[PDB]
Amino acid sequence: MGHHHHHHSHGKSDFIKVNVSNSHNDAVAFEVKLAKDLTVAQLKTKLEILTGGCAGTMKVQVFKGDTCVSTMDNNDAQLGYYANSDGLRLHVVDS
Template sequence: MGDFVQINVSNSQNDTVSFEKKFPRDIKIAELKGKLEVITGASAGTMQLLLFSGDKLIAQLNDDEAELGSFAIENDMRLHVVDNVQSFIDDGNVEKFDLTDKQYDERRNTVRDYLKTRRLGKYNDDEMKAIEERKKQEQLEQEQKAESINIGDRCLVTAKGPRRIGTIRYKGTFHLKPGIFIGVEFDEPLGIHNGSVDGTKYFECQEKYGSMVPIGAIEVGDFPREDDGLDDDEI
């Protein structure tokens, strides 16, 4: 077993997997929450972490002093970040916290107090500067790649899942997520919509032939057209 574990991270605002991340197995849950606060925008103080294998709940990571590796965690599992709620898995009820941000900030022996005392997460200026520089570099790389992509180009989507080839129909912003996105019309019904998302129309195609894909998951090239031989609604 390695010293690091690679997991998918999702959050309560968007149930889909948003990114992959590698963490050391000996990181404490409180410090992990601090890092996830910077990445997801969820508050470490009211954050709950749920570990899933597929759709099966494996564990609730409630012990802030425990190490990540002390849980039954394996590569490619999913860590779901729940922000500002306390989930009761047994009966499905949800109870919201009533503490104001100021009241929580004044408390001791909390996750926020732990992070501030140890200068972790957003309370570490050097770490925040490094994250900001990394974001700027990623944005620059996205912009440079976007300049080389044209509407009508053939492309391969390199994200996990079935091999998906299609034609670029849109490039630009996406109202649900930050960054540059590419609208792809697939050769086969391996998408999730018809070019419209939540009433916003980005391009036109048949139902289940379109997807909005992060620009980093796009490879442009001379890809031959795939035969449309699928009869199901696989996405």
């Protein structure tokens, strides 16, 4: 169905596809796209509303299989800083 096509010329398209799951909550978001220009604090605020938990007690950790890639400890860090690859799994820890 078409061997070639043209771009929509939308412009900015820096987004990655990752899976998000919450610990103390049955709410799970699948195939959620997020801009890489988003900061960690901005990610916590967006997730805070989604999980309704407390961003001051909510922690975010990166998981990729049976080994953890890294934990967002630097707030002044960008989302694409640790999530520069798709297929990653983010686990929200509310405690």
